[PDB]
């Protein structure tokens, strides 16, 4: 309930100022945000100021998308961490891919609560 879904979204997908956005960055942040037991297969972090991310839920920075999602009007710096290897348990090895594009989220009570990872899946 509450706004715990929104804070979980930030915990799993928001990192204001990255610094190195390399493989090691991924391994560190994934452990730091508690996504390493089990290792998340793929996870994307959005960078920048929180206000623009929140605005995706309003017409100021978002457009309806598919059934119940929103796609941002503006582009965001993002870093996708893809697990390399076969084990779901630590040590988790991650490969990082820095990117710059709009993102798709689900909003609830005007706050982003879910990030659609599919668009960051490069098969």
UniProtKB/Swiss-Prot annotation:
Effect of residue 39 to W: In ALS9; reduced ribonucleolytic activity; low angiogenic activity; reduced mitogenic activity; reduced thermal stability
Coiled coil spans: none
Record keyword Oxidoreductase present: no
Effect of residue 17 to I: In ALS9; loss of angiogenic activity; reduced ribonucleolytic activity; retains nuclear translocation
Tissues showing expression: Expressed predominantly in the liver. Also detected in endothelial cells and spinal cord neurons.
Main location: secreted
GO cellular component: actin cytoskeleton; angiogenin-PRI complex; basement membrane; chromosome; cytoplasm; cytoplasmic stress granule; cytosol; endocytic vesicle
Motif extent (Nucleolar localization signal): 31-35
Residues at the active site: 13 (proton acceptor), 114 (proton donor)
Presence of the UniProt keyword Secreted in the record: yes
Associated clinical condition: Amyotrophic lateral sclerosis 9: A neurodegenerative disorder affecting upper motor neurons in the brain and lower motor neurons in the brain stem and spinal cord, resulting in fatal paralysis. Sensory abnormalities are absent. The pathologic hallmarks of the disease include pallor of the corticospinal tract due to loss of motor neurons, presence of ubiquitin-positive inclusions within surviving motor neurons, and deposition of pathologic aggregates. The etiology of amyotrophic lateral sclerosis is likely to be multifactorial, involving both genetic and environmental factors.
Designated name of the protein: Angiogenin
Gene source species: Homo sapiens (Human)
Lineage, highest ranks first: Eukaryota, Metazoa, Chordata, Craniata, Vertebrata
Full-protein residues shown: 25 to 147 of 147
